[PDB]
Design a protein around this ligand. Structure first.
Ligand SMILES: [Zn+2]
Ligand SMILES: [Zn+2]
Ligand SMILES: [Zn+2]
Lengths: 213, 213, 213
């Protein structure tokens, strides 16, 4: 006779053992967060309250760790998070690939009320301040996006530091500090000036709603 | 003793209850359509005859509804469909985010014989006419793509209206009507002039073929 | 009384039967390769030793076949492989869509030690030489990328032939041989000059590591 045992979250796995990762860690997920069954969370990850991780998302902390997703933020469909090796095989920090936020080191840091829209990708080292909207298909790698910024659909920041309150126009691929520093300011009449607030609201409500059903 | 009950389509879920969506709706999928087991269809969706929804696709009608995918069309790998809140919490239409096709309102409307190639994304409000080819990695948001158009790999249309028979060159991000209006005409010698017909054919055959196996 | 039978790899399916494909084929995967449970491999595919196919990847050889992924290479999250119909319904090769490598025909050919970073896409006809790094979100279609090249994040090669040792700068969409021929040479001080070696190393170790757990 058979006896079946079911794991309801085989998609929320843990870290594998590698020369740089001898002891597997597993995602720490706040109870209020909603991880879609078809999303994938692996390794040293920390998801906060009310985070809404949509289908096909892939948060994978197995090379560079850890990845942090703040409260009220959201990881939409297709979004991918990953980072470059933060530790070598001798247990030595690979400083170049580590970002620091408030005295804590991270391979990827997503603050609070941050929107990683459909298809965007953020790759460590990286940091994205609170209330920032990473638009559809955007890309952020080896950069530091400040607070209240807005990367419109298709923009990309690579190896630069976006100051707070700036926005990168659709399709613009920023790769020099000179350019970053000249980015436009988010004003009250800027089209995406309020997009984040709305997206956040919707997603936060989607999280709990999806939690019953 | 145990008794196991299986749902063959947990990937074809329904809408959750939110302040703007009090009564969950579920995807209406024509019988001839093929929804890959690793695809995800959620909420108020209507897929037509012979549609081929490939792996990792995500059609998610939970914020702005509804999403419509016409007959003989196809949603390839990675494609994402989503829309902006079409109703507020008072049951008031958010007109700005609603598109109208033949007297019917939609959050996202994909006509017949339309190809949403690998990795493309279409976000409401949006409408894409019949026989149009939304190329690999393309992006269409707050726009209205006409019939027989061709958005080559990487093109993007944002807040503009592409006239019928035009095509957006690879990598071009269109964001102004001025530009949209000056788009090239699809001629018989234009390279992608017949790409849709082919893609449609293959996919339509892929749908039924995948239906046995 | 019930008896349950489990398929551990419903994600590693086989080809369906179509007018151009009368006899289904199935992926041939070297034992050392690791195919993430949430990845999808379909049809005439050949994956080599130590390949690391990440979550949400979609390798789909059902239209144009076959797709080949050499030894020590890697298919990261979101990556998509697909090709244009290589055979018509009469069993006649559609020459235009077939690429040749060492006397063997392929719809898509990924050599050894090749990295298809997060979200990239390669569509047949295509060929990508050994030790090449197809950066995050890149796109390669109807082209032939040579050895030791580097397509930085967002680059794209369409219908061109990148010579060996070149690199396409971030965001650049190359679509003319003139342009391709003028691409920069990868030098020892080029930033991505060693990125591949590292990525390969990590992924190869991730493959085996993920094999225990
Ligand atoms: Zn990575
Ligand atoms: Zn959306
Ligand atoms: Zn294709």
């Amino acid at each position: 006779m058979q006896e079946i045992t079911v794991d309801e979250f085989s998609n929320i796995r843990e870290n594998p053992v590698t020369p740089w990762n001898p002891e597997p860690s597993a995602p720490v997920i706040d109870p209020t967060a909603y991880i879609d069954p078809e999303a994938s969370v692996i390794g040293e990850v920390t998801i906060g309250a009310n985070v809404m991780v949509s289908p096909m998302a892939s948060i994978r902390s197995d090379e560079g760790m850890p990845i942090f997703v703040g409260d009220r933020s959201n990881v939409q469909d297709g979004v991918v998070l990953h980072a470059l090796e933060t530790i070598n095989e001798e247990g030595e920090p690979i400083e170049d690939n580590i970002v620091e936020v408030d005295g804590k080191e991270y391979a990827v840091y997503i603050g609070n009320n941050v929107s990683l829209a459909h298809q965007s990708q953020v790759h460590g080292p990286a940091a994205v301040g609170d209330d920032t909207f990473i638009g559809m298909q955007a890309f952020v790698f080896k950069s530091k996006v400040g607070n209240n910024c807005v990367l419109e659909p298709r923009s990309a920041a690579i190896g630069v530091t976006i100051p707070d309150g700036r926005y990168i126009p659709a399709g613009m691929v920023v790769t020099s500090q000179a350019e970053a520093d000249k980015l436009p300011e988010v004003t009250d009449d800027y089209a995406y000036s309020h997009t984040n607030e709305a997206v956040v609201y919707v997603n936060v409500h989607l999280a709990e709603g999806y939690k019953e059903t």
